[PDB]
Amino acid sequence: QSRPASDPQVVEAARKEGRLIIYSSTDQSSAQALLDDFRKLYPFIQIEYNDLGTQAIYDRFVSETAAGASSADLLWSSAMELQVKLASEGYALPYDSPEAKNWPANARLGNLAYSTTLEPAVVVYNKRFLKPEEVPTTREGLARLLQEPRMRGRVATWDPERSAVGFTILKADYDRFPAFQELARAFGKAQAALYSSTGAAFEKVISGEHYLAYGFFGSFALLRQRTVKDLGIAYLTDGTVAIQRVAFINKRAAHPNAAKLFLDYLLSLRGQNLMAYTALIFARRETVVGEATPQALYKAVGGKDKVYAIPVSTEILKNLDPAERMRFLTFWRQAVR
Ligand SMILES: [Cl-]
Numbered sequence: 001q002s003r004p005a006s007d008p009q010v011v012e013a014a015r016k017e018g019r020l021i022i023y024s025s026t027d028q029s030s031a032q033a034l035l036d037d038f039r040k041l042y043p044f045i046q047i048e049y050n051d052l053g054t055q056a057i058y059d060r061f062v063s064e065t066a067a068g069a070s071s072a073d074l075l076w077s078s079a080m081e082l083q084v085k086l087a088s089e090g091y092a093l094p095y096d097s098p099e100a101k102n103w104p105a106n107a108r109l110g111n112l113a114y115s116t117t118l119e120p121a122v123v124v125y126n127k128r129f130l131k132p133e134e135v136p137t138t139r140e141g142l143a144r145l146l147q148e149p150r151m152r153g154r155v156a157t158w159d160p161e162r163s164a165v166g167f168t169i170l171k172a173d174y175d176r177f178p179a180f181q182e183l184a185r186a187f188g189k190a191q192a193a194l195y196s197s198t199g200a201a202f203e204k205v206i207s208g209e210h211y212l213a214y215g216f217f218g219s220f221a222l223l224r225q226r227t228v229k230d231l232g233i234a235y236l237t238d239g240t241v242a243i244q245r246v247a248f249i250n251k252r253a254a255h256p257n258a259a260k261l262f263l264d265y266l267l268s269l270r271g272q273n274l275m276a277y278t279a280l281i282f283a284r285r286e287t288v289v290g291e292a293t294p295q296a297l298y299k300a301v302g303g304k305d306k307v308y309a310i311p312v313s314t315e316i317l318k319n320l321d322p323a324e325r326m327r328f329l330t331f332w333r334q335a336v337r
């Protein structure tokens with residue numbers, strides 16, 4: 001009774017194909033439950049899951065296509081600007097997902113690419129050093145906390161010069177919230193350490209070498225919290241930036257119908273529910289019940305209007321413009337040093 005909406009012509013052509021190749025940035029141990037469940041629905045499809053860095057996905061896909069080689073059927077990546085760039089340059093199979101009828105226009109590049117997640121950039125902290133009631137939930141509040149001598153060298157955030165996702169998140173913050181400028185200068189005052197990776201930042205918070213990290217995905221925070229009871233999460237109430245992992249089907253898929261079934265599964269309530277519940281990846285689909293969901297996120301930030309979803313839109317390509325990049329990085333480097 002929860003099987004994704006299927007075109008019978010598509011399921012029958014997927015049987016003949018009987019294979020699916022995925023290039024994905026989602027860690028395989030996070031995706032596993034979805035792969036196993038997809039196979040229970042479509043046990044006639046053999047999956048090749050390639051778990052790759054977001055740059056690897058873009059380079060590898062661009063290479064194979066250009067050399068004319070067989071590449072991925074489906075590309076699934078948290079690098080929104082690179083996915084949107086490929087899908088707006090002829091790399092994407094146009095396909096109207098029957099599971100995406102209620103997707104907001106800003107969660108889909110028409111029929112070229114789809115959001116699969118709505119993941120908030122949050123504050124994480126070490127509850128042995130900071131109690132929940134003293135962790136501010138606004139940029140101005142965090143800027144105030146970081147004036148305290150006890151916070152000097154105790155703060156982590158992204159290095160937007162070494163992380164594409166870190167860039168997306170901090171740039172969205174800078175473009176949307178004036179108070180971000182005060183907070184960036186406070187990272188300077190506090191001698192914030194910058195990280196190219198969520199895991200390197202989280203390790204230092206768990207160790208107590210930092211007490212607080214700003215701008216990391218709630219999905220990773222929740223996943224680590226399962227293991228680590230001293231990890232606190234605070235949601236920003238003056239405005240939260242959310243990233244959307246983008247999926248699209250290769251225009252040249254060898255198995256385009258298998259890729260439609262998997263894209264439909266990723267978007268369905270069955271797939272979105274399993275992703276939220278088992279992977280603790282914040283779902284896109286608003287009907288999912290549980291902690292890693294739009295409803296839970298909206299209650300935590302004080303309403304839907306306080307979440308800015310980075311859109312699945314060619315408008316985000318301004319982030320790749322050298323002049324725009326430079327203006328942001330010029331401000332950033334001046335403020336945080
Ligand atoms: Cl990361």
Ligand code: NA
Nearest residue numbers: 005006261264
């Ligand atoms: Na389907």
Ligand code: NA
Nearest residue numbers: 268269285287
């Ligand atoms: Na639904």
